[PDB]
Design an enzyme around this catalytic site. Structure first.
Site, short mmCIF file in Angstrom:
data_model
loop_
_atom_site.label_atom_id
_atom_site.label_comp_id
_atom_site.label_asym_id
_atom_site.label_seq_id
_atom_site.Cartn_x
_atom_site.Cartn_y
_atom_site.Cartn_z
N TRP B 127 0.86 -1.19 0.00
CA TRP B 127 0.00 0.00 0.00
C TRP B 127 0.90 1.25 0.00
O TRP B 127 1.60 1.50 0.98
CB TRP B 127 -0.84 -0.03 1.28
CG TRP B 127 -2.03 0.86 1.28
CD1 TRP B 127 -3.00 0.93 0.32
CD2 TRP B 127 -2.42 1.76 2.32
NE1 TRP B 127 -3.97 1.81 0.70
CE2 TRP B 127 -3.64 2.34 1.93
CE3 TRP B 127 -1.86 2.12 3.55
CZ2 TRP B 127 -4.32 3.26 2.72
CZ3 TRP B 127 -2.54 3.04 4.34
CH2 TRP B 127 -3.76 3.60 3.91
N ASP B 208 -0.95 -5.03 9.48
CA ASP B 208 -1.97 -4.18 8.91
C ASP B 208 -3.18 -5.04 8.55
O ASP B 208 -3.16 -5.73 7.52
CB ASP B 208 -1.42 -3.51 7.65
CG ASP B 208 -2.30 -2.41 7.14
OD1 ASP B 208 -3.39 -2.20 7.70
OD2 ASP B 208 -1.91 -1.73 6.18
C1 LIG Z 1 -7.91 0.65 3.67
C2 LIG Z 1 -6.66 0.28 4.06
C3 LIG Z 1 -6.14 0.74 5.27
C4 LIG Z 1 -6.88 1.70 6.21
O1 LIG Z 1 -7.81 2.60 5.72
P1 LIG Z 1 -8.49 3.60 6.69
O2 LIG Z 1 -9.57 4.02 5.63
O3 LIG Z 1 -7.60 4.72 7.04
O4 LIG Z 1 -9.24 2.89 7.73
C5 LIG Z 1 -4.90 0.31 5.67
N1 LIG Z 1 -4.19 -0.54 4.93
C6 LIG Z 1 -4.65 -1.02 3.77
C7 LIG Z 1 -3.73 -1.97 2.99
C8 LIG Z 1 -5.88 -0.63 3.29
O5 LIG Z 1 -6.33 -1.16 2.07
O1 LIG Z 2 -5.48 1.26 -1.59
C1 LIG Z 2 -6.72 1.26 -1.68
O2 LIG Z 2 -7.30 1.26 -2.78
C2 LIG Z 2 -7.56 1.26 -0.40
C3 LIG Z 2 -7.54 2.62 0.32
C4 LIG Z 2 -7.81 3.76 -0.67
C5 LIG Z 2 -8.28 5.06 -0.05
C6 LIG Z 2 -7.32 5.63 0.96
C7 LIG Z 2 -6.41 6.60 0.59
C8 LIG Z 2 -5.52 7.12 1.53
C9 LIG Z 2 -5.53 6.66 2.85
C10 LIG Z 2 -6.44 5.70 3.23
C11 LIG Z 2 -7.32 5.19 2.30
#
Ligand SMILES: *Cc1c(COP(=O)(O)O)cnc(C)c1O
Ligand SMILES: O=C(O)CCCCc1ccccc1
Ligand SMILES: *Cc1c(COP(=O)(O)O)cnc(C)c1O
Ligand SMILES: O=C(O)CCCCc1ccccc1
Lengths: 388, 394
Positions: B127, B208
């Protein structure tokens, strides 16, 4: 690894809440005749309306919603709101706005210092210490007169240089309750534009002093004079949505370019800290602000609250006067907001809480909202007993 | 003073959507979304969540400041949802946060407090926000092999070889399940070997967990986390309620600090509350209270698990369907990985150049690293995606 964690110092007010015929005069929240912090009529109705209108909870705006950003700017700066030169960031309450403010500024100036009022909200200094930012103090409260040491305040501010930040409470100064007059604000605006010091304004109680518009007077005056200002606003108290965690940071810039920069740096600041900002409370605020019916009722209820406390200060001031002949505690009626420092010495305040059961912050900060016709005479008598 | 500020690059999501909206093709497709979308293209509010909001609306009498580190109902319920019966209250520190991201940031702050010279190992890939937050904090960042572009699976030998270099006190970031963006995950056995490497190296694991319930099940997806939790004395977990509860904008999550003993738990818990206090004071109540309501109220917990499972089965069938289509189209089982990946994401293994060709020739949009969102598919879109993939020679 976690065993290396040094123990961290507790927050006074939160700890005071811990130590709590008990009289709660500590934490800064509004309370009604029956010791309750109710939910505002408009806020509840907003929530009910939200329950029916919302169809999704997908990720929304990184810097808050347009409606929140606009409605908040108008509430704060009124007709002084110049969108093209104003950047807005929805944050996690006022505190979140303050932290984001210090982060933004330090990015723009790695060598910035922050002047704060002597005294000021304890959490102001803790955040600055944590970030490792140099804190300087400017005289503000006058121990003897219980008013503002304006001659001294101006003296200290004159030493501020370009790139420094001066933290000013827009109204209802926490913890003193002592506030500058618009005439005093005009003078500070003079000094500020001579020193080049960036002003950061902590607007947490707009509506508890003299009124929605009147409490924003000083802030509007600074914003009209100083080309670049930072305002950290909170919807916790004037909207009674403390736990929703909603406020915002406004960055007033000299032009559109500088403004575009700030806005970008502000969005990024949110992204790297928690991503998107909390939506529920912000939605309540805008819904209220943009709905005439709701706005009208909210203004009315807030007015009722601001009026009641004013009445209380008068009762309390009177109670004390008749309880000592001397009109020494008149400063209470002069103060404006939720707090007022009685001036009691540290050794005296302790007596009060252990024996009288009345809990007030160690620096003698009393939340006037914690009093009522029943407890006022008790408090008055209690402090008269504590003498000197 | 603000004129100095260096230009901060956009969130990029807006740029992704920018070109998409501008596309004048009536049949354009968007697999770049990072949220769940049902058959009708909507991100619905879960039945239980709407149930919880009405009950809160009728029972909340105040909105005064509440728990600095979160409310007890939320901490316990969340720790149970994650660690199940294995939840050791005595050595578990919990912090309600502003989403999973807030949890990740708070975890990094906590770690750095305990160990200034901390380094962090992240997967390859991972991510993007992971990297950006770290870079912003100025933490040293290392990478350990993960996705195998050839098989689209987990290059485990590579992962182990690299993780072996971690030292005592270093932090190794692991996705507990449904690896974003890959979709390639570790089998419980591989998790067991990872645990061994961690014990050996003394590195602290940060897990995570943002998609519990989207892979093979609530319990199943928590397996890797629970294994690590039982064998390793110190574990940091950053959970998210954004996706599995469908409350994205509410910003609900929490940081769990598993400690070696109570005295240490008191240390961590204190430091965590301090971190909330110094950042934004109290955490956001609304979402966390919706969660602790669904989880404690049997009727609602039931309907929530049912809805989540329906979504899970749904995306899974979509995978089988896409891979089936791909099978008939290629005459081989090359794309079988799509049926084996878990989570809502999947990296096809297409080069940026192949990704561009797909967009231009087929009107299908996806992230530039070939990450697609399974939820964006359906019976009409699958045949087109399948053909595009083959056609562009992926
Ligand atoms: C969505 C996501 C998070 C956390 O998202 P929040 O919207 O801030 O709760 C953390 N790690 C991964 C890999 C995610 O896809
Ligand atoms: O990586 C993805 O597509 C899932 C989260 C996408 C939206 C997101 C952006 C920034 C921080 C938290 C969440
Ligand atoms: C209330 C308050 C704030 C902000 O409180 P939030 O709960 O973070 O909205 C900031 N400064 C002062 C002086 C306050 O009283
Ligand atoms: O009572 C006050 O001082 C106003 C703010 C009260 C809430 C608060 C207390 C401690 C730390 C952060 C926020």
């Amino acid at each position: 690894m976690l065993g290396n964690l040094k123990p961290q110092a507790p927050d006074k007010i939160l700890a005071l809440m811990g130590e709590f015929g008990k009289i709660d005069l500590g934490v800064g929240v509004y309370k009604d005749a029956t010791g309750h912090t109710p939910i505002m009529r408009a806020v509840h109705a907003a929530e009910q309306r939200m329950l029916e209108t919302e169809t999704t909870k997908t990720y929304a705006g990184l810097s808050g919603e347009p409606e929140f950003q606009k409605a908040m700017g108008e509430l704060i700066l009124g007709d002084g709101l110049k969108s093209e030169t104003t950047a807005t960031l929805a944050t996690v309450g006022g505190t979140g706005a303050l932290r984001q403010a210090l982060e933004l500024a330090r990015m723009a100036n790695p060598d910035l210092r922050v002047f704060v009022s002597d005294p000021t909200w304890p959490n102001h200094v803790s955040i600055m210490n944590f970030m490792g930012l140099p804190v300087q103090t400017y005289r503000y409260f006058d121990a003897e007169t219980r008013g503002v040491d304006f001659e001294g305040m101006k003296a200290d501010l004159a030493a501020a240089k370009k790139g420094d930040m001066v933290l000013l409470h827009g109204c209802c100064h926490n913890p003193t309750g002592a506030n500058l007059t618009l005439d005093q604000w005009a003078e500070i605006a003079s000094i500020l534009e001579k020193t080049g010091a960036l002003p950061l304004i902590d607007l947490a109680y707009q509506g508890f002093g003299d009124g929605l518009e009147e409490d924003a007077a000083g802030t509007r005056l600074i914003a009209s004079r100083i080309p670049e200002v930072l305002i950290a606003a909170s919807c916790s108290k004037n909207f009674g949505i403390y736990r929703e965690r909603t406020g915002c940071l406004l960055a007033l810039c000299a032009d559109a370019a500088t403004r575009e920069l700030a806005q970008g740096a502000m969005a990024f600041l949110n992204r790297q800290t928690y991503s998107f900002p909390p939506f529920h409370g912000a939605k309540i605020v805008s819904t209220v602000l943009t709905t005439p019916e709701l706005r009208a009722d909210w203004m009315a209820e807030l007015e009722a609250v601001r009026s009641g406390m004013l009445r209380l200060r008068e009762q309390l001031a009177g109670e004390l006067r008749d309880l000592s002949g001397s009109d020494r505690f008149g400063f209470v009626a002069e103060h404006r907001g939720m707090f007022s420092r009685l001036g009691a010495t540290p050794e005296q305040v302790k007596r009060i809480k252990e024996e009288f059961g009345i809990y007030m912050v160690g620096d003698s900060r009393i939340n006037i909202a914690g009093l009522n016709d029943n407890t006022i005479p008790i408090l008055a008598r209690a402090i008269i007993e504590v003498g000197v």
